[PDB]
Symmetry: C3
Subunit: 610 residues, 3 copies
Amino acid sequence: EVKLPADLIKDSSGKSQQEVNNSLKLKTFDDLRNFKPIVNGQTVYVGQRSNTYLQGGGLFYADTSDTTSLDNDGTILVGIDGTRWKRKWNTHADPCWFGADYTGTEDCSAQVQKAVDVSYGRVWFGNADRSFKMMTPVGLPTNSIVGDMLMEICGDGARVWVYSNTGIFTSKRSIGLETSTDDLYTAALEIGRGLRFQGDGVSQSVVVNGDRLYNVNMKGGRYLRISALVRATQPRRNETTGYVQSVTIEENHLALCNRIIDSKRGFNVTVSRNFCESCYGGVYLDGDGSPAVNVIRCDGNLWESSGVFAKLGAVYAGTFIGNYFEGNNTGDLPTLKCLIELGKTGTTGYSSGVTFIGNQFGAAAAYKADVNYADVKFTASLSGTNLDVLAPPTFVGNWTNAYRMWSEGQVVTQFGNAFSGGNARRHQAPKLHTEARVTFDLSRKEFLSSTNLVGGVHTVAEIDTNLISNLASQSSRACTADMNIFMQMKTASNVVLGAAVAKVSLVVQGSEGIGTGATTDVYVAASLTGFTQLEGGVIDTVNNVSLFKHFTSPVLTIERVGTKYLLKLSGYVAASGSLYGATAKVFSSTTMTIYSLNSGASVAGQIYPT
Amino acid sequence: EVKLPADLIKDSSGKSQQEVNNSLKLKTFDDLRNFKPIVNGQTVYVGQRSNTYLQGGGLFYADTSDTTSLDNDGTILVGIDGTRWKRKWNTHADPCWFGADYTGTEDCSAQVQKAVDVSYGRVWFGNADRSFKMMTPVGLPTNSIVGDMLMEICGDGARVWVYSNTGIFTSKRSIGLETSTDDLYTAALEIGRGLRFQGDGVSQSVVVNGDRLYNVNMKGGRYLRISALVRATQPRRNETTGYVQSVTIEENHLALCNRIIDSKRGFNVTVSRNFCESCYGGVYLDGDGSPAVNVIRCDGNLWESSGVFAKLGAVYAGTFIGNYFEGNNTGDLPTLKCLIELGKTGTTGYSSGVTFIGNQFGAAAAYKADVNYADVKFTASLSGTNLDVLAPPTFVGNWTNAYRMWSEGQVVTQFGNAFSGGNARRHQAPKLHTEARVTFDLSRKEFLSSTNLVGGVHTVAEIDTNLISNLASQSSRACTADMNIFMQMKTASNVVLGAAVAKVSLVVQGSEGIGTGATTDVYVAASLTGFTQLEGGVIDTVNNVSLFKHFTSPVLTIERVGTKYLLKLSGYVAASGSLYGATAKVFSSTTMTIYSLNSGASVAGQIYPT
Amino acid sequence: EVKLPADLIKDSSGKSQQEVNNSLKLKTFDDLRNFKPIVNGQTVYVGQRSNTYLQGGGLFYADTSDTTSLDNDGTILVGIDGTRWKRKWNTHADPCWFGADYTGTEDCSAQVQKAVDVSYGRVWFGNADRSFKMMTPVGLPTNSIVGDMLMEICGDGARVWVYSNTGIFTSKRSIGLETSTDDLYTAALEIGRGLRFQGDGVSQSVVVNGDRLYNVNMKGGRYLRISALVRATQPRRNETTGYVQSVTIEENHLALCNRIIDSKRGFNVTVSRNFCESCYGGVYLDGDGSPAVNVIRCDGNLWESSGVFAKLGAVYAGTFIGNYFEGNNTGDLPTLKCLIELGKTGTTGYSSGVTFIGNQFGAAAAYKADVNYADVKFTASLSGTNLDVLAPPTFVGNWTNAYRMWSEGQVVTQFGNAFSGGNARRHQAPKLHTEARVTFDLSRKEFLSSTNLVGGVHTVAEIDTNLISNLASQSSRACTADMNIFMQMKTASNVVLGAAVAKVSLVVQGSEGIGTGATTDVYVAASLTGFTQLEGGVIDTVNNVSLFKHFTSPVLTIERVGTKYLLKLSGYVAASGSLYGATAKVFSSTTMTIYSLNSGASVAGQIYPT
Ligand SMILES: [Zn+2]
Ligand SMILES: [Zn+2]
Ligand SMILES: [Zn+2]
Ligand SMILES: [Zn+2]
Ligand SMILES: [Zn+2]
Ligand SMILES: [Zn+2]
């Protein structure tokens, strides 16, 4: 009854109380454009974009100094009075500010593009209540490999439906020139943190256009039914196919994706520590280049119920450390019959420098007995004895239960691998001598003639058995061994006047299987199997001095001293009658080849040269 | 004196000016529930939850279309007039919205659970001024390994006091059925970014229930006096104990934690690049399974003043690359006397495929001379000569100063390791031939009879010394070597009519210790140590052709040509009188074993076959 | 015309309507300090700091309980009426709250310091529209290695211009005592996420003071023309130079930086997976310590058009896995002529335990033919035959096209490496026997005398050719081999009464080059090259039993049985007439050295002992 309208009250600014009250009633963008500020620099809150679009709200301040900026329908809203309202924001741009459909019904790429332009490429898609749909490539601003920008595409749980045969994210400067042979790239991008990229699986969905996006860190994202995380099919620069360059795919959750990388060539590629579940294909870089892949690392990934993890071309400097493979039987795996393909395979070039360490190749039952299956398939270049240029791959400490871990005969060095249900011999690969319980030893010892020369018999070597006797078990002590005793006959000043080499064979055996009366002493029998010496050769062309034949039909004798054995040769006559004087010593470089296999578990025979 | 009450002024909405003014006085949640909106879709700001609870404030809009939603005391607040007020938020849920005690006095798990339910598992705990206490497991929504969700538990520095024997975070669908043998799991979780999990050290605190949380990335968090980051004790599926599956613990700050992982079985486990200070235990997965651990990687960790870093059972495909151990002497280390335990140890099964690369085992003074200490303790399965199934672990490029790096006699392949203050021999392990300065060479050369056959003497091999002479130092030149000359006698069309092998021993020596008159030429003396040839064997059952004895008591002669040496055998008579014709050449596959040890620093003798 | 001033309307709080209206007109900090709250606990919005400073706005509530807190010009603003206004914030502190110049014109370090103090070291710099300049070190609060804090320096794209010779970020407790020899450190820091650190390149810019900041994760940042990411030059504790401790530099974008790390000593250093473009220097830790670096890992980095990647001192437990080097020719590289320098070089100590796996050393054209260039330069300690203490570095699976991959003669173990355009021999390094197509085999077989003794001829070994015949290609079958047959003569209860060893040489050859009439059978010829046996040695000192000479001038014969070959020795007489009885069997531990080189691509000869 007692009612005074607020329009009859005047605020000190000159505007009515009704106009002051109206600044708390700004629900939509249209309400702001129809609102006139009461003071200069006023900040008001707009609730949402429209009555149907519940996102896009925020604070807007009337920039009284700006009378020319255009309305962009997101961060600069121009009122009917001409007031330039500008959104207050110091973080990442939200495509919802510009009207991106958070229900996933319509293509929001144009609105995502608007958020890219005002944020210098730093876009954030919000929480899990939002689901966006992008069907048009969005271009990131141009930033060279040495540029001053850092771009990010991230979120707080939102979902992005992807519809693109080439990549919903690319370089802005390639838009309109998508098929250009020029390097229209942009670099330095973090993408995926807090984002769920998803495809429907019945159409093409590519997230990153690898033709145009270099130096990319893809981490922390979920990818579901995505045809390819990265794709590149555009020839440019020195390449006749598309290629990817400096892409790191790490710590993601991949599921039901057709490919991780889809291209023909790669530079500095990393795909490590990703949880991949039921993916139909991994890293495909199977072009015919020399090489196709310049460095790839695939470490600590999970690859379960999946297809071919990597179908690669020629690979230089490849590493695959600690991957987890379990029950993979889909995608191209039933046809290629391998988890990894390297060069050369078919038209592909030869690989060079690839190392597999600590992988588990847990096979589905179908490939345990498939004679045409190998975990890693390739052809090495072995027609020449020299392997300098095209180094075949090596395998260290891996575990498989498949028919084969690699193509038979294509690997030269491998140790520590496990072939559960199969055998190493089937791979036609060399076995390291260590796994045959063969160990090598060596020593250098000087035998002065004044001490080790009696009646033409010269001591040439000394071995010890004291550590053999120290072993606890009788069955560990015995061993056999070869000896290469390189003898250099020298004067007092170490001038070499002669040279020879002896080949000796040994057997070491003590008490074995004996309780009462057993001893720790172990005995050696030696036999001179070979001998050769130089009988000539000018070593001093000024004074006419030649290497001297010091031994005349030598015979080997050994003598036990304590626990040691002195090996000696007969028929010794020292050189003399020259500028350098007489031979004062025999300097012996002894190298032993010990065969440790005995009745016990000894892997290294403890005989050694002193 | 001149006072008109605001209740006598009417706003265009129909409500009084006093009611318009009241929308700026909403301090607590009770003020909002007692407030009636002036327009439809009005957004007002609530300052805090109550007069005592200073958090939980935010913007709320009157959803005029909603007349049925229930009050949840956090994001949907229903007023006395029936207005459904809904919080404006597009980011992560804050448990403080629902009343989580930010002082750490009362259990806030129920409020954390409320934030989980409305955020699809994306909870954020705020800044370092907050300290929460959780004593009841909070369950994350169900998401399979191929599910469409990505969940996160993160913060901006807040602290969470943990009180749980099983894990404050688990799967929601396991709540009420915690002891179920079914796989009531949920997957895809990022946890720890910007969060400080802390226990009091006098009670049980577990962060992640590994029985129910799979595909977990634990990164960026601080953990202080936490009994276990991950624990799993519930048997399920094919396992008779609890197990962890696809857990990655990376880039965290661990201090005074009792265990990193506490279970008996593991699948696809990663614990890398964590700063661990004074932790009493690391990765414990020491069940009796075959195996206990299916792939584990522990790389680049810091482990100082700590206990046993890893007490594991049987491990398949294990890798430990580049860890940093320094002065560890607490926890179970004084009893187990090792930094890492592998299978087999006690009841545990045998390991297969484990590689240690580039670790530093910096011991406390107590374990440098402890004969019962080894950095890595295990028992290998060496009763058979074949090591295909149970591949013993290998060690490459590690550094220790402890008594032992591994259990004596249990390692077959190891190179590049450093045993400061100790010795390699004490490990009873084979020494690679490369470390004994032994190098291998090989060549294939054809010696046509028309060129290399004079009076029954046939040239069979050719070695060169030109690169020996090229060496700068005299002491590097000399060497000795063995020769395996596999000779295949072939016709013009490369039909093999005979086969033999010669064993040759060589010594190479030139000027050494000589100034005036020295020459670069080095001389070779050879000796035929062994010879054998095939004298029969049907190779053509249709025409009745057998392998022919080409040599009759051969004698070895050598001839110096330039810098090369031609090795020749006598008593040669070519095969003839058959369908294939006469022997036209000797095709020699020469393999050399070079013993490089001399008076200099030569590690590879530069004699080689041509 | 009909105008009632708002000052004549009274709100229920007792304040006039004009004062109520004024709470929506608070543009600057001065407007808030001049504003009096209408109710207790009122929250008002301040638009910005001043009319010229457009940042720093936010919500402030009148804390009626606080009458003593001082104004800090950022989060606590005290009004003229004495009202303590406190900013509502539960996230990271913004230096703009305190007036940090977002245009980069003036030093904002004092304002950054204010944000550190109120956030417990959790500072956030905002979006790419901001560019700050810091010229004074900002100190982080004290937190020990076992402390309860987690600190972060991050942003949302902002740029920070860096001007500091020591580090714009350091420990607070070192300020004023910067040259102290005490360990005035603080630990647990995440720095760089969403931040662009930039220098002008004509002055000193260091981001992290490594003398005072330990346990640092530097990830996700862009660094442009920064003199050093980490620098440490202050001697302290047991060190005579500065050092870095537990610094991880991972997943960054480095460009045109002078150094990554600039110091003389390091502990637990990680520099992995960084995109480095045109950087003039990497990890410099080249002090004379023993060692200089306690564990360093540099994995998966990009290093293009850059300088020396790592000039290190003595390194213990170093790893370099999978780096990508391409066309580096600037910085110190033209003078040092290497990509990596290790100890010893010059005054630097010797390294021990360093492994290079899977790197690509892609050289600029200038270093392909430079005889003074090597990818990794160092001097190994090879004056002694024993390499236990100072283990030389090893190289596995790397790829280079430079003149050398390492300093000649300084590497002992290396395999799988590629030397495009060069050769392995030039490195003066041993070649693993596997690359020479040499493979080892072994077996243990018991030959009971009742079965394998006829007329003094005793079967001592059995080899099989069945798998040789199984090979598809004729050229793959043939091979030669050595045999070490360790024979232990035992009684029925396995008491060793004798021991001997035979050296045998073999040649295996079948049909080769033959179509019609060819057979799969392959034939063996054996020759006894060496033999030795023990003829004495007390094994039972109680009963006076010695090892017995079982063989009297033995002659080797072989017999083909199916596909097997039985090797036999003559002159056998069993021991007898003692407490243990007679010799009942010959237990043979056979170890074979197979030389697989033939006319085909065989790398492992398929002869084996049974
Ligand atoms: Zn409206
Ligand atoms: Zn962002
Ligand atoms: Zn109240
Ligand atoms: Zn979040
Ligand atoms: Zn003003
Ligand atoms: Zn933060």
